mmCIF file of C-alpha atoms in Angstrom:
data_model
loop_
_atom_site.group_PDB
_atom_site.id
_atom_site.type_symbol
_atom_site.label_atom_id
_atom_site.label_comp_id
_atom_site.label_asym_id
_atom_site.label_seq_id
_atom_site.Cartn_x
_atom_site.Cartn_y
_atom_site.Cartn_z
ATOM 1 C CA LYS A 1 7.228 -18.257 -1.736
ATOM 2 C CA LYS A 2 8.339 -21.809 -2.776
ATOM 3 C CA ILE A 3 6.674 -23.463 -5.771
ATOM 4 C CA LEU A 4 7.204 -27.092 -6.853
ATOM 5 C CA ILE A 5 6.602 -27.404 -10.589
ATOM 6 C CA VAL A 6 5.840 -30.980 -11.508
ATOM 7 C CA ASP A 7 6.036 -31.336 -15.267
ATOM 8 C CA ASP A 8 7.242 -34.157 -17.485
ATOM 9 C CA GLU A 9 7.871 -31.731 -20.393
ATOM 10 C CA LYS A 10 11.084 -29.752 -19.888
ATOM 11 C CA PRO A 11 10.091 -26.875 -22.280
ATOM 12 C CA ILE A 12 6.914 -26.185 -20.297
ATOM 13 C CA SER A 13 8.691 -26.594 -16.951
ATOM 14 C CA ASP A 14 11.264 -24.084 -18.128
ATOM 15 C CA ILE A 15 8.650 -21.495 -19.065
ATOM 16 C CA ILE A 16 6.729 -21.831 -15.809
ATOM 17 C CA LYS A 17 10.054 -21.796 -13.853
ATOM 18 C CA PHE A 18 11.120 -18.582 -15.695
ATOM 19 C CA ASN A 19 7.829 -16.802 -15.028
ATOM 20 C CA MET A 20 7.542 -17.902 -11.374
ATOM 21 C CA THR A 21 11.157 -16.837 -10.805
ATOM 22 C CA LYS A 22 10.404 -13.378 -12.326
ATOM 23 C CA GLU A 23 7.604 -13.137 -9.734
ATOM 24 C CA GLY A 24 10.135 -13.721 -6.931
ATOM 25 C CA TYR A 25 9.176 -17.314 -6.063
ATOM 26 C CA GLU A 26 11.762 -19.920 -5.232
ATOM 27 C CA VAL A 27 11.274 -22.750 -7.736
ATOM 28 C CA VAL A 28 11.918 -26.492 -7.394
ATOM 29 C CA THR A 29 11.181 -28.855 -10.272
ATOM 30 C CA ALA A 30 10.197 -32.476 -10.608
ATOM 31 C CA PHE A 31 9.824 -34.424 -13.857
ATOM 32 C CA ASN A 32 7.841 -37.518 -12.777
ATOM 33 C CA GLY A 33 5.579 -38.628 -9.959
ATOM 34 C CA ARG A 34 8.389 -40.154 -7.868
ATOM 35 C CA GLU A 35 10.401 -36.955 -8.023
ATOM 36 C CA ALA A 36 7.223 -34.986 -7.249
ATOM 37 C CA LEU A 37 6.665 -36.859 -3.965
ATOM 38 C CA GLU A 38 10.338 -36.778 -3.062
ATOM 39 C CA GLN A 39 10.571 -32.973 -3.670
ATOM 40 C CA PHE A 40 7.301 -32.415 -1.854
ATOM 41 C CA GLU A 41 8.703 -34.242 1.219
ATOM 42 C CA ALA A 42 12.164 -32.692 1.125
ATOM 43 C CA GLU A 43 11.322 -29.107 0.053
ATOM 44 C CA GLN A 44 7.890 -28.590 1.627
ATOM 45 C CA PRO A 45 6.697 -26.193 -1.135
ATOM 46 C CA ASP A 46 3.966 -23.654 -0.380
ATOM 47 C CA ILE A 47 2.190 -24.631 -3.615
ATOM 48 C CA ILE A 48 2.488 -27.335 -6.297
ATOM 49 C CA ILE A 49 1.781 -26.950 -10.037
ATOM 50 C CA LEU A 50 1.053 -30.448 -11.198
ATOM 51 C CA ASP A 51 1.366 -31.208 -14.913
ATOM 52 C CA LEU A 52 2.056 -34.850 -15.630
ATOM 53 C CA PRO A 53 1.844 -41.204 -16.664
ATOM 54 C CA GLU A 54 -1.897 -41.122 -17.677
ATOM 55 C CA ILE A 55 -3.098 -41.062 -14.001
ATOM 56 C CA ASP A 56 0.241 -40.404 -12.190
ATOM 57 C CA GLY A 57 -0.744 -36.752 -11.667
ATOM 58 C CA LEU A 58 -3.997 -37.903 -10.078
ATOM 59 C CA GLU A 59 -2.081 -40.350 -7.809
ATOM 60 C CA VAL A 60 0.478 -37.694 -6.896
ATOM 61 C CA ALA A 61 -2.331 -35.363 -5.790
ATOM 62 C CA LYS A 62 -4.110 -38.235 -4.024
ATOM 63 C CA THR A 63 -0.950 -39.211 -2.183
ATOM 64 C CA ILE A 64 -0.058 -35.705 -1.096
ATOM 65 C CA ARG A 65 -3.575 -35.232 0.291
ATOM 66 C CA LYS A 66 -3.116 -38.145 2.690
ATOM 67 C CA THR A 67 -0.675 -35.915 4.634
ATOM 68 C CA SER A 68 -0.930 -32.288 3.462
ATOM 69 C CA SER A 69 -3.324 -29.477 2.565
ATOM 70 C CA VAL A 70 -0.693 -27.747 0.378
ATOM 71 C CA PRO A 71 -2.437 -26.080 -2.582
ATOM 72 C CA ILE A 72 -2.276 -28.017 -5.813
ATOM 73 C CA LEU A 73 -2.918 -26.327 -9.115
ATOM 74 C CA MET A 74 -3.301 -28.967 -11.722
ATOM 75 C CA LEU A 75 -2.366 -28.197 -15.316
ATOM 76 C CA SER A 76 -3.299 -30.312 -18.283
ATOM 77 C CA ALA A 77 -4.056 -30.368 -21.980
ATOM 78 C CA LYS A 78 -7.122 -32.502 -21.201
ATOM 79 C CA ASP A 79 -10.031 -30.122 -20.909
ATOM 80 C CA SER A 80 -13.167 -32.262 -20.546
ATOM 81 C CA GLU A 81 -15.711 -31.969 -17.710
ATOM 82 C CA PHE A 82 -14.742 -35.418 -16.452
ATOM 83 C CA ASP A 83 -11.054 -34.486 -16.387
ATOM 84 C CA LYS A 84 -11.579 -31.213 -14.472
ATOM 85 C CA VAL A 85 -14.091 -32.761 -12.082
ATOM 86 C CA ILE A 86 -11.938 -35.741 -11.249
ATOM 87 C CA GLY A 87 -8.835 -33.593 -10.728
ATOM 88 C CA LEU A 88 -10.634 -31.379 -8.216
ATOM 89 C CA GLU A 89 -12.372 -34.268 -6.386
ATOM 90 C CA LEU A 90 -8.967 -35.982 -5.862
ATOM 91 C CA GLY A 91 -7.709 -32.805 -4.214
ATOM 92 C CA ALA A 92 -6.615 -30.208 -6.719
ATOM 93 C CA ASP A 93 -7.614 -26.739 -5.654
ATOM 94 C CA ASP A 94 -7.672 -25.534 -9.235
ATOM 95 C CA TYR A 95 -7.300 -26.987 -12.725
ATOM 96 C CA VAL A 96 -6.052 -24.897 -15.647
ATOM 97 C CA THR A 97 -5.904 -26.159 -19.253
ATOM 98 C CA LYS A 98 -2.951 -26.123 -21.636
ATOM 99 C CA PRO A 99 -2.072 -23.927 -23.367
ATOM 100 C CA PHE A 100 -2.395 -21.358 -20.648
ATOM 101 C CA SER A 101 -1.900 -17.673 -20.144
ATOM 102 C CA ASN A 102 1.360 -16.987 -18.239
ATOM 103 C CA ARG A 103 -0.557 -14.241 -16.504
ATOM 104 C CA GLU A 104 -3.763 -15.787 -15.218
ATOM 105 C CA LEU A 105 -1.531 -18.654 -14.104
ATOM 106 C CA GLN A 106 0.467 -16.144 -12.107
ATOM 107 C CA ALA A 107 -2.846 -14.764 -10.848
ATOM 108 C CA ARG A 108 -4.174 -18.237 -9.941
ATOM 109 C CA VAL A 109 -0.981 -19.158 -7.977
ATOM 110 C CA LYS A 110 -1.408 -15.811 -6.132
ATOM 111 C CA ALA A 111 -5.111 -16.475 -5.428
ATOM 112 C CA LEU A 112 -4.258 -19.950 -4.112
ATOM 113 C CA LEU A 113 -1.490 -18.657 -1.853
ATOM 114 C CA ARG A 114 -3.729 -15.841 -0.654
ATOM 115 C CA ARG A 115 -6.363 -18.460 0.308
ATOM 116 C CA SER A 116 -3.953 -20.871 1.951
ATOM 117 C CA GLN A 117 -1.785 -18.283 3.689
ATOM 118 C CA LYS B 1 -23.563 -24.736 3.522
ATOM 119 C CA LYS B 2 -25.003 -21.303 2.487
ATOM 120 C CA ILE B 3 -24.374 -20.022 -1.040
ATOM 121 C CA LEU B 4 -25.275 -16.527 -2.302
ATOM 122 C CA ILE B 5 -25.862 -16.643 -6.051
ATOM 123 C CA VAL B 6 -25.484 -13.205 -7.552
ATOM 124 C CA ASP B 7 -26.837 -13.267 -11.082
ATOM 125 C CA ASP B 8 -28.718 -10.689 -13.120
ATOM 126 C CA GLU B 9 -30.171 -13.412 -15.402
ATOM 127 C CA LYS B 10 -33.036 -15.266 -13.713
ATOM 128 C CA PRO B 11 -32.779 -18.408 -15.959
ATOM 129 C CA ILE B 12 -29.134 -18.929 -14.990
ATOM 130 C CA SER B 13 -29.798 -18.119 -11.327
ATOM 131 C CA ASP B 14 -32.564 -20.699 -11.365
ATOM 132 C CA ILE B 15 -30.321 -23.421 -12.769
ATOM 133 C CA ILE B 16 -27.495 -22.759 -10.323
ATOM 134 C CA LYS B 17 -30.053 -22.518 -7.445
ATOM 135 C CA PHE B 18 -31.578 -25.898 -8.499
ATOM 136 C CA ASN B 19 -28.211 -27.650 -8.687
ATOM 137 C CA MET B 20 -26.830 -26.155 -5.446
ATOM 138 C CA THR B 21 -30.074 -27.087 -3.674
ATOM 139 C CA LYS B 22 -29.766 -30.707 -4.959
ATOM 140 C CA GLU B 23 -26.299 -30.706 -3.347
ATOM 141 C CA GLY B 24 -27.850 -29.770 0.017
ATOM 142 C CA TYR B 25 -26.735 -26.120 0.141
ATOM 143 C CA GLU B 26 -28.983 -23.393 1.434
ATOM 144 C CA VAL B 27 -29.342 -20.868 -1.396
ATOM 145 C CA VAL B 28 -29.915 -17.101 -1.291
ATOM 146 C CA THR B 29 -30.144 -15.086 -4.500
ATOM 147 C CA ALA B 30 -29.376 -11.542 -5.524
ATOM 148 C CA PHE B 31 -30.059 -9.974 -8.925
ATOM 149 C CA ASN B 32 -27.894 -6.815 -8.861
ATOM 150 C CA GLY B 33 -24.893 -5.438 -7.021
ATOM 151 C CA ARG B 34 -26.947 -3.640 -4.347
ATOM 152 C CA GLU B 35 -28.851 -6.800 -3.517
ATOM 153 C CA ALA B 36 -25.555 -8.727 -3.548
ATOM 154 C CA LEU B 37 -24.043 -6.511 -0.827
ATOM 155 C CA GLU B 38 -27.257 -6.426 1.169
ATOM 156 C CA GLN B 39 -27.598 -10.270 1.091
ATOM 157 C CA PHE B 40 -23.918 -10.680 1.858
ATOM 158 C CA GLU B 41 -24.335 -8.499 4.991
ATOM 159 C CA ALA B 42 -27.629 -9.988 6.143
ATOM 160 C CA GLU B 43 -27.096 -13.684 5.269
ATOM 161 C CA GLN B 44 -23.336 -14.084 5.754
ATOM 162 C CA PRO B 45 -23.013 -16.793 3.043
ATOM 163 C CA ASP B 46 -20.137 -19.280 3.195
ATOM 164 C CA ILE B 47 -19.464 -18.700 -0.517
ATOM 165 C CA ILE B 48 -20.623 -16.307 -3.259
ATOM 166 C CA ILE B 49 -21.099 -17.118 -6.968
ATOM 167 C CA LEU B 50 -20.827 -13.785 -8.678
ATOM 168 C CA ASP B 51 -22.284 -13.437 -12.176
ATOM 169 C CA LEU B 52 -23.226 -9.886 -13.045
ATOM 170 C CA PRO B 53 -23.456 -3.691 -14.793
ATOM 171 C CA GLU B 54 -20.209 -3.951 -16.896
ATOM 172 C CA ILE B 55 -17.931 -3.623 -13.788
ATOM 173 C CA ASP B 56 -20.536 -4.016 -10.974
ATOM 174 C CA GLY B 57 -19.374 -7.605 -10.377
ATOM 175 C CA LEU B 58 -15.809 -6.342 -10.008
ATOM 176 C CA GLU B 59 -16.975 -3.624 -7.545
ATOM 177 C CA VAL B 60 -19.079 -6.116 -5.598
ATOM 178 C CA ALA B 61 -16.026 -8.359 -5.161
ATOM 179 C CA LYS B 62 -13.840 -5.340 -4.361
ATOM 180 C CA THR B 63 -16.294 -4.110 -1.755
ATOM 181 C CA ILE B 64 -16.744 -7.457 -0.063
ATOM 182 C CA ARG B 65 -12.963 -7.835 0.214
ATOM 183 C CA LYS B 66 -12.710 -4.665 2.298
ATOM 184 C CA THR B 67 -14.393 -6.622 5.136
ATOM 185 C CA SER B 68 -14.448 -10.360 4.354
ATOM 186 C CA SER B 69 -12.398 -13.295 3.080
ATOM 187 C CA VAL B 70 -15.545 -15.212 2.019
ATOM 188 C CA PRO B 71 -14.771 -17.228 -1.131
ATOM 189 C CA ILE B 72 -15.955 -15.660 -4.349
ATOM 190 C CA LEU B 73 -16.334 -17.718 -7.478
ATOM 191 C CA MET B 74 -16.821 -15.391 -10.353
ATOM 192 C CA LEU B 75 -18.807 -16.540 -13.374
ATOM 193 C CA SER B 76 -18.872 -14.784 -16.700
ATOM 194 C CA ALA B 77 -19.295 -15.153 -20.432
ATOM 195 C CA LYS B 78 -16.176 -13.000 -20.879
ATOM 196 C CA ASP B 79 -13.277 -15.384 -21.237
ATOM 197 C CA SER B 80 -10.221 -13.273 -22.099
ATOM 198 C CA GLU B 81 -6.921 -13.294 -20.174
ATOM 199 C CA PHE B 82 -7.515 -9.709 -19.070
ATOM 200 C CA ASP B 83 -10.986 -10.563 -17.766
ATOM 201 C CA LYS B 84 -9.837 -13.611 -15.756
ATOM 202 C CA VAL B 85 -6.738 -11.852 -14.445
ATOM 203 C CA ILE B 86 -8.581 -8.760 -13.325
ATOM 204 C CA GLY B 87 -11.333 -10.782 -11.636
ATOM 205 C CA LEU B 88 -8.808 -12.734 -9.572
ATOM 206 C CA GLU B 89 -6.641 -9.690 -8.702
ATOM 207 C CA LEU B 90 -9.748 -7.869 -7.346
ATOM 208 C CA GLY B 91 -10.379 -10.821 -5.048
ATOM 209 C CA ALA B 92 -12.147 -13.660 -6.787
ATOM 210 C CA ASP B 93 -10.807 -17.006 -5.703
ATOM 211 C CA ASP B 94 -11.836 -18.603 -8.971
ATOM 212 C CA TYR B 95 -13.293 -17.541 -12.314
ATOM 213 C CA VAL B 96 -15.345 -19.921 -14.457
ATOM 214 C CA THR B 97 -16.621 -19.065 -17.958
ATOM 215 C CA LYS B 98 -20.164 -19.313 -19.293
ATOM 216 C CA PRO B 99 -21.496 -21.672 -20.413
ATOM 217 C CA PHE B 100 -20.303 -23.928 -17.658
ATOM 218 C CA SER B 101 -20.554 -27.525 -16.620
ATOM 219 C CA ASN B 102 -23.054 -27.938 -13.737
ATOM 220 C CA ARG B 103 -20.647 -30.507 -12.385
ATOM 221 C CA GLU B 104 -17.228 -28.884 -12.332
ATOM 222 C CA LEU B 105 -19.057 -25.873 -10.910
ATOM 223 C CA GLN B 106 -20.297 -28.109 -8.127
ATOM 224 C CA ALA B 107 -16.734 -29.399 -7.806
ATOM 225 C CA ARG B 108 -15.252 -25.870 -7.746
ATOM 226 C CA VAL B 109 -17.698 -24.680 -5.007
ATOM 227 C CA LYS B 110 -16.664 -27.808 -3.024
ATOM 228 C CA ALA B 111 -12.937 -27.136 -3.576
ATOM 229 C CA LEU B 112 -13.403 -23.522 -2.456
ATOM 230 C CA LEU B 113 -15.315 -24.505 0.676
ATOM 231 C CA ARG B 114 -12.766 -27.210 1.431
ATOM 232 C CA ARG B 115 -10.010 -24.547 1.235
ATOM 233 C CA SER B 116 -11.838 -21.927 3.263
ATOM 234 C CA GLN B 117 -13.318 -24.266 5.862
#
């Protein structure tokens, strides 16, 4: 029920926030890696959408994984095999490219929650 | 450690089998939906790659979900929002389009296993 949206672009954060809210999730937002870790610690989200700075997203996921198995769905405009592979290896549970379907993304957050209880 | 590859195309099954074997997984194969359910029941795989017949894959996943939370990674040449969304809603944990990166796909099976223990 609580999603932390980590996104350095306010337009995209706003759209994901809107759509997650319409689904009935409680939404917290962060706009850089420091805020992401702070919100993760303070709010203890059930899932994180991570969309960050050219490596900060990877470090955020890395850092969270030291202490927590919270599902991380990484989002990114980078779509190469290396990018996807490295995101997952560093602890993302899923990696979705930008631009994305609002749906699917709803369906992927549901699948992740279903699988993490 | 045991993967059931459900694929009606022997060339693709062979490639996934080869690559999963190189990773150290035990591989069982099925080539239609009936075989998929039979192998699922008899072999109790730790994960299923499901790549089937225009709805049989969806029914296979549906049927398995009546009894089991085993991770299902659906694979398909169909790449539309509807296709991805419906696969996940019917119980797939992930959906990867064809053609796929042998890597990533290795990384996605690992992420799924990591998340399912």
